[PDB]
Amino acid sequence: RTIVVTTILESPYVMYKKNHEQLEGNERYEGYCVDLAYEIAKHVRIKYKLSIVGDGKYGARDPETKIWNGMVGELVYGRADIAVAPLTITLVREEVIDFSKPFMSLGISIMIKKGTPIESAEDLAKQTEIAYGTLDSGSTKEFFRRSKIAVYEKMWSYMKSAEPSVFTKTTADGVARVRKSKGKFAFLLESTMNEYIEQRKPCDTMKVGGNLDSKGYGVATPKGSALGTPVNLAVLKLSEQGILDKLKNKWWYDKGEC
């Protein structure tokens, strides 16, 4: 009767509460996806337990073993019933799991330390002084690997061979590298994460240029799961009631520091 909700520690979607080490179960966490899971479970009338994905990854398929990792693998292998996380709806994932209609819009974007002389992907592509990278095992890395657009093909050729590695294990590690690199590293990440970090102390980063694509996050369920339909209607209802909007303002802008 208690369903397992896989999710990932990524600010401001799921974060440890201030005193989390004194708390237990769902009470350990807060953020946009913690609130979304609560609202969804309320409408679908299920009890649930949040479970941070062990490997800390969104989900990709190993080309060798063909095994899915991350939250996607938790659904595929039957270890979680739903994922409520900033999980990008992509074709390769839709082949193996189901997604709700999207609860948030986003695009890939460029994060720079303020003052870096870069305004566009073209600007990064044509130079070599400023290194740049992306998160491992997620949809941004796959966007670059799969693109047939000249500028992004050039960026992928550079990142794939860069030494030392430009692929980070977590978003926070990429942000930290931008902040510590005196303008010499830029990070490619989703506009939602980029806009959140831009509003947080020390206010030394910014999003530059427009987004490189336009896509959405959805709530995911194992393929053919009976929960898929009610979850989808719940997301649509929350959207129409203005709740998704209220949550975005709560977690991004209400508390902005910059």
Ligand X SMILES: COc1ccc(C(=O)N2CCCC2=O)cc1
The annotation places the binding site for L-glutamate at 86, 88, 93, 139-140, 190
Distance between CA 96 and CA 76 in Å, rounded?
Answer: 7
Q: Binding of Zn ion at residue 39 (CB under 5 A)?
A: yes
80 exposure class (CB count in 10 Å sphere: 0-12, 13-18, 19+): buried
Longest distance between any two alpha carbons in the chain, whole Å: 56
CA distance 35 to 243: 10
Find the shortest distance in angstroms from Cβ 38 to Zn ion: 8
Q: Which one of the spans 72-80, 99-107, 109-117, 182-190 is the region binding ligand X (CB under 6 A)?
A: 99-107
- Residue 120 or 232: which CB sits closer to ligand X? 232
Fill in the amino acid letter for 138: G
Q: Work out which of 17, 43, 79, 101 binds ligand X, going by CB under 6 A.
A: 101
* DSSP reduced 3-state for 193: helix
Nearest approach, Cβ of 128 to its own copies (angstroms)?
A: 26
Contact residues toward ligand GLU (CB under 6 A) are 58, 86-88, 135, 138-140, 189-190
Asked whether position 248 contacts ligand X by CB under 6 A, the answer is: no
Count interface residues toward ligand X (CB under 6 A).
Answer: 11
Q: Binds 86, which of Zn ion, ligand X, ligand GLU, none (CB < 5 to 8 A, cut-off by type)?
A: ligand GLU
With CB cut-offs between 5 and 8 Å by kind, which of its own copies, ligand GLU, ligand X, none does residue 135 bind? ligand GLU
DSSP code per residue over 69-95: -HHHHHHHTTS-SEE-SS-B--HHHHT
Residue 127 contacts which entry, Zn ion, ligand X, its own copies, none (Cβ below 5-8 A, type-dependent):
none
**Judged by CB under 6 A, does residue 215 bind ligand X?**
yes
Among 105, 157, 229, 241, binds ligand X (CB under 6 A): 105
The residue with its CB nearest to ligand GLU is 138
* Dihedral over alpha carbons 217, 143, 52, 37 (to 10 degrees): 0
Beta pairing, strands 15-16 & 104-106: unpaired
Binding-site residue set: 86, 88, 93, 139-140, 190
What 3-state class would DSSP assign to 147?
A: coil
For residue 195, what are the contacts with CB-CB under 8 A and spacing of at least 6? 207, 252
Residue 127 touches ligand X, criterion: CB under 6 A:
no
Site residues (vs Zn ion, CB under 5 A): 16, 39
